[PDB]
């Protein structure tokens, strides 16, 4: 069945316990979250941009993480389901290198996750998020936007940054599940991939992309 298309190459070699949340979830230790979250800056600390927008390092829990465009990733490096965001959340499963779905839990060395993304409406999704084998959240998408501006607090925008550039909307710059610097798409594995969002509030929202209406739940802070 289609659960067999989940790459399940998981190895808790760092002794964190992270595989528990794939089952008996609700045990997260949020003590280190304030230190991790202090590395994320509110949008107001970035420089205003202007001029024509063109297309362009870690901590994927910050909204302003600037990802690389999605490609094809070996299934041996993935643990659990891959979610991509249209912005509505969709699951991408294992295939062979030619795109035929495969049903061996990603254990075959030819198995891959073809995440190659082109922004909707002409494409498939804005970005993707998954967990790698040792429990680190990985994300890809966009590519994010260079909005101009001067100084060392210049913003590569991977979400809706309207306040810093009028044209840097999510349709233009979205690169993953961050709808705005304060909101990310809610989905069954959000708490596993983004555990420090545990206390975010859940809002019913609507987004329009090329005139297609998306009704989704957003988790906001």
């Amino acid at each position, epitope marked *: 069945w289609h659960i067999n298309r989940t790459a399940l190459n998981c190895n808790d070699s*760092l002794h964190t*316990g992270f595989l528990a949340a794939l089952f008996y979830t609700h045990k997260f230790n949020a003590s280190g979250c304030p230190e991790r979250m202090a590395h994320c800056r509110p949008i107001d600390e970035f420089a205003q941009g202007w001029g024509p927008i063109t297309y362009a390092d870690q901590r994927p829990y910050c909204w302003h993480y600037a990802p690389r465009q999605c490609g094809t990733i070996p299934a041996s490096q993935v643990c659990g389901p891959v979610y991509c965001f249209t912005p509505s959340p969709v699951v991408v499963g294992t295939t062979d290198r030619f795109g035929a779905p495969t049903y061996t839990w990603g254990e075959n060395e030819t198995d891959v996750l073809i995440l190659n993304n082109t922004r909707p409406p002409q494409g498939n999704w804005f970005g993707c998020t998954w967990m790698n084998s040792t429990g680190f959240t990985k994300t890809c998408g966009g590519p994010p936007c260079n909005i101009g501006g001067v100084g060392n607090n210049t913003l590569t925008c991977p979400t809706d940054c309207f306040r810093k550039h009028p044209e840097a909307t999510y349709t233009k710059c979205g690169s993953g599940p961050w709808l705005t610097p304060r909101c990310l798409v809610d989905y069954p594995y959000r708490l596993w991939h983004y555990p420090c969002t545990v206390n975010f509030t859940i809002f019913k929202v609507r987004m329009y992309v090329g005139g297609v209406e998306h009704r989704l739940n957003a988790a906001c802070n």
Partner: antibody
Amino acid sequence: QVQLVQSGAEIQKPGASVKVSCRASGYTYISTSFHWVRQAPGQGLEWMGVIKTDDGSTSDTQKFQGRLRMTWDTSTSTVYMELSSLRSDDTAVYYCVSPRLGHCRRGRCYETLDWGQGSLVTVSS
Amino acid sequence: IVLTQSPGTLSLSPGERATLSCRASQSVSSSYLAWYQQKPGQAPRLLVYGASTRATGIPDRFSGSGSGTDFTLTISRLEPEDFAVYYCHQYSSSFWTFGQGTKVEIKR
């Protein structure tokens, strides 16, 4: 990085009680089961009981009925083992043990075991 | 579930291969058979879990195999630090039980 930190060595008279503690540390997701196993000088390993932190549910062996009491303090992530009416042959190193998922392969995941460093309890007059 | 280890004492030289057996009275899933090393005065050190999965940090020369009622721990090339007591351990049934130990000593 998971480390189970037990309390230090203890000496008690026969008939008394001892309370051994085991503090969970370094977890990102805290395990739900803690077992106690003991090893007397020069002997093998013997399972005593288990506490489930979710329920407070405890299961023990009938060799220690009435004397063994296991509790969980959720605010300090510390499990306690209390053994009452001590006899000299309760002299042993007492270990807390907590299973944890180590890896997955072909749709099924497999538990490994994190061990505390042991607590020596010596019972003597 | 009684676990019976054999032999009680293995007298080998460094570089030789060691093979330790564990036999259970009833059947246990591979899923829940662990092997430990224990040195005098120290705590048991986990070597393999799930019968055949080496714990992280454990050198490659240690490997576990078997299923059902019969399980094996192999050290391919004994090193000086490997002479110790070894225990098997079934944890499939919440009432855990352990083997009685195999001592691996130096032959001379």
